[PDB]
């Protein structure tokens, strides 16, 4: 996307909130709206627990996602300016 290495975006709606399998990627997906271009895309969170922390209308940093749904290119890295992985290890709290 663009020329940047990261993007800030807005959580629309954790589509796949009605999921049956826990670790499925359509559970872990979320539609975001990248701000600068105002564009809707979807991204993955690495873990369902972190999906529980993320809520709507929080600013989301995300980046590339490179290595059952191949094609989602982005992965969320920071929400409201805090590291998702540090929340996930329970290092910091999330500013609301």
């Amino acid at each position: 996307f663009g020329g940047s290495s990261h993007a800030k975006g807005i959580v629309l709606e954790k589509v796949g909130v009605e999921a049956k399998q826990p670790n499925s990627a359509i559970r872990k997906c979320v539609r975001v709206q990248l701000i600068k271009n105002g564009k809707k895309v979807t991204a993955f969170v690495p873990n369902d627990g972190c999906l529980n922390f993320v809520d709507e209308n929080d600013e989301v940093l995300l980046a590339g996602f490179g290595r059952d749904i191949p094609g989602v290119r982005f992965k969320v890295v920071k929400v409201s300016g805090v590291g998702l992985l540090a929340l996930w290890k329970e290092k910091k709290e999330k500013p609301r």
């Binding site: 663009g2 940047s4 990261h6």
Partner: peptide, 10 residues
């Protein structure tokens, strides 16, 4: 180019 990418980061 690095200045352009840096500015986009800004």
């Amino acid at each position: 180019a690095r200045q352009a990418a840096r500015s986009h980061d800004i």
